[PDB]
Amino acid sequence: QSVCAGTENKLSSLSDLEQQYRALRKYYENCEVVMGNLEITSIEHNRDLSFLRSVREVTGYVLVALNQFRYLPLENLRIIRGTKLYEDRYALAIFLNYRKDGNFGLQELGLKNLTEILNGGVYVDQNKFLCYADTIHWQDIVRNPWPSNLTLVSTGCGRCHKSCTGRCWGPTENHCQTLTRTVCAEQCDGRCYGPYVSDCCHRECAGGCSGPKDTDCFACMNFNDSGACVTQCPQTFVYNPTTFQLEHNFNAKYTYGAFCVKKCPHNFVVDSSSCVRACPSSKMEVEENGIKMCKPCTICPKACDGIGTGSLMSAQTVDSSNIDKFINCTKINGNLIFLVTGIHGDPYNAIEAIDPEKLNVFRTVREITGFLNIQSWPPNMTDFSVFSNLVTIGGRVLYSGLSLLILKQQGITSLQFQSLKEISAGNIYITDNSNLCYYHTINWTTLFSTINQRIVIRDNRKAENCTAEGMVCNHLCSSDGCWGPGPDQCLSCRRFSRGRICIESCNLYDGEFREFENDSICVECDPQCEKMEDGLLTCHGPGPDNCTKCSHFKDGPNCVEKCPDGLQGANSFIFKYADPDRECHPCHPNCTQGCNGPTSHDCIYYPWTGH
């Protein structure tokens, strides 16, 4: 229950042998569980290492090399998990522990309780003064003996106490090696404390046991939940009999090493059912049910300084030297400016011009709290589709009353601000884009937030010379206009929408995947809803309880692929049978493996157990 990080220095040590010893002691001082590697190196002859008696478990490997002390005090080291291995091979490595051309050197191993090495091999050789080690039957300690090549122990040595002869860590009687796996009966799944069936330890017991219960283990094979060795921690979701579906489990626990905890350690957060340093890239840290945890994002939020804010205050424009400074940004706290100097750069003074493909970096942007000034753009780029996910332009700050500006650009035909829906404050100014159309089709008033917000549009390709040239808004679009060609470039849909695309109607009566309409938005019906023909809707809302008919079975109000077959419940596994009408009902509590019906005589049993 005391925890500490290990080290990964391997054969790296401090020149000052005094500081080395002091280092070791500071690290594993009163540590019971080393969540990493136990590395003991470059320690001199007379130094007491009695503080090492605190270590009961090591999840990584144990390295003992270049030492000179006499006795290794790890009499409490019960197990080494081998999550990491020395030289990618050993969970335990002991070598070259003697003074070159001297008399000092490791002589005895105090590993009286080392009965479990879950993963990896053992290397113990090149220890001039080491004794006894070779008497130990490592086959009983090392869980995975393959390749046998990786389990090597070789050795004026004393004798083992009469009580064991041939198998001891030292002369002390209580230092005789205790066998915990090889001496067991066939019936034992794992370890034992005697040669008889009644001596078998519980499945989840590592190292050995002092009893038959999963609470009598010396160490757990997987996790430790409140003293009980279990295969897994209380699940994050359990079946709720009233809602007829899995629900967040308020008793859920999380993994932290070999422990199940209710709350993760200080600098950790919950990701699914484990405790981690930081949330994975696809999730963000949030407070949910009084617990910090990682919730999947729908691109995760990431604020960034704009041109003229914070780390970019000196900047006057986005340029090749700060463009990568907007990677994965979602919200820009400030302005985004595009001046000629930034677009064309300055070759003579070695300042590269903006590489057009890198402008795709703004596709993640959804908001701009300030203004968007575009006085220059790559010649070959026809639109601003790199801003396709742009939703809001706050206009918190304005360029002399302007919140959006697009001047003198000749290489642009359309805007394509696909997701643009809000321009809080400031006025718009799109001028001198003789090749730009669609701009006249927009009802800018839709995007505004107040009456005190004007629009200024001048010498852009005449509405007429487009209107006639083929530059028209798709028919499936509202009278609010579009940002360019296609049904996926409109302000509002005329009929309905499926994603960013405007369409004629939802898949209400036909289609590969049936849908329901939610205020003009088409949403697919749950997969369990049976597709209905001849004018019948397949669903009237989302989820397995809003179907017209279930395609398989029905658990209470929910359409399910199959009735509950061993689902994790609050106190036990949930089982149900299906009546002739494919309706699910509870199995009798005495049926711990399923049933055919309600009766106590309707119990059925797993077909995959026993010979």
Ligand X SMILES: *[C@@H]1O[C@H](CO)[C@@H](O)[C@H](O)[C@H]1NC(C)=O
The piece of 138-146, 308-316, 387-395, 542-550 that touches ligand X (CB under 6 A) is 542-550
Tokens found for residue 52: 């090492």
**Pairing, β 223-225 against β 217-220:** unpaired
- Smallest separation, CB 518 to ligand X (Å): 9
Query: Rounded distance, CA 587 to CA 600, Å?
Result: 8
Bridging pattern class, strands 584-586 and 573-578 = antiparallel
Residue of 229, 312, 482, 532 that binds ligand X (CB under 6 A): 229
Residues in the chain: 611
Closer residue to ligand X in complex, CB, 22/213? 213
Size of the site for ligand X (CB under 6 A): 36
Nearer to ligand X, 1 or 15 (CB): 1
Binding region for ligand X (CB under 6 A) out of 184-192, 225-233, 313-321, 418-426 = 225-233
Q: How many helices (H) and strands (E) does the chain have?
A: 3, 42
Q: How far is the CB of 402 from ligand X (least distance, A)?
A: 21
Min CB(281)–ligand X separation in Å = 4
Member of 45, 213, 262, 540 binding ligand X (CB under 6 A): 540
CB of 193 to ligand X, least distance (A): 10
Write out the binding residues for ligand X, residues 445-464 only, by CB under 6 A. Answer: 445-446, 462, 464
Could you tell me which residues are beta bridge partners of residue 269?
276
Letters for 65-104 (x = contact with ligand X by CB under 6 A, - = none) are: ----------xx----------------------------
Sign of the C-alpha dihedral computed for residues 212, 218, 219 and 221 taken in this order: negative
SS3 call for 103: coil
CA angle 256, 251, 208 (to 5 degrees): 50
Q: What are phi and psi of 6, to 5 degrees?
A: -95, -160
Site string for ligand X, 287-326 (x = CB under 6 A): ----------------------------------------
Q: Which stretch binds ligand X (CB under 6 A): 125-133, 186-194, 212-220, 270-278?
A: 212-220
By CB under 6 A, residue 541 contacts ligand X: yes
Q: What's the min distance (Å) between Cβ of 102 and ligand X? A: 27
Closest CA to 152 of 121, 189, 131, 180: 121
Nearest alpha-carbon partner for 390 in 330, 339, 326? 330
Residue with Cβ nearer ligand X (466 or 595): 466
**Site stretch for ligand X (CB under 6 A), options 91-99, 221-229, 344-352, 563-571:** 221-229
Q: Does 508 bind ligand X (CB under 6 A)?
A: no
Cα–Cα distances (Å) from 516 to 476, 494, 508, 510, 549, in that order, read 19, 17, 6, 11, 14
Phi-psi group of 520: left, alpha or beta (phi > 0 → left; psi -120 to 50 → alpha; rest → beta):
left
Please, what is the minimum distance in Å from the beta carbon of residue 539 to ligand X?
A: 8
Site for ligand X in 269-288 (CB under 6 A): 281
Least spacing, CB of residue 148 vs ligand X, in Å: 9
Question: Is residue 390 a contact residue for ligand X (CB under 6 A)?
Answer: no
Phi, psi (degrees; rounded to nearest 5) at 225: -110, 105
Tell me, rounded to whole angstroms, the distance of Cα 10 from its chain centroid: 29
Sign of CA dihedral 167, 169, 171, 175: negative
357 binds ligand X (CB under 6 A): yes
- Cα separation, 506 vs 385, whole angstroms: 27
Burial class (CB in 10 A: 0-12, 13-18, 19+), 368: buried
Minimum CB distance to ligand X smaller for 399 or for 448 = 448
The reply on whether position 327 binds ligand X by CB under 6 A is yes
Cα–chain center distance at 189? 33
Between 168 and 587, whose beta carbon lies closer to ligand X? Answer: 168
Residue from 217, 307, 493, 584 in contact with ligand X (CB under 6 A):
217
Binding of residue 158 to ligand X (CB under 6 A): no
Q: C-beta of 252: minimal distance to ligand X in Å? A: 18
Site map 471..500 versus ligand X, x via CB under 6 A:
--------xx--------------------
- Among 81, 112, 191, 494, the residue binding ligand X under the rule CB under 6 A is 112
Buried b (16+ CB within 10 A) or exposed e, 329-357: bbbbbbbbbbbeebbbbeeeeeeeebeee
* Minimum CB distance to ligand X smaller for 170 or for 594: 170
Handedness of CA 388, 394, 397, 400 (dihedral sign): positive
Residue 557 as a binder of ligand X (CB under 6 A): the answer is no
Longest dimension (CA), the chain: 108
How far is residue 77's CA from residue 310's CA, in Å, rounded to a whole number? Answer: 53
Residue ranges binding ligand X (CB under 6 A): 1, 75-76, 112-113, 149, 217-220, 224, 226-227, 229, 281, 327-328, 356-357, 378, 380-381, 443, 445-446, 462, 464-465, 479-480, 540-543, 545-546
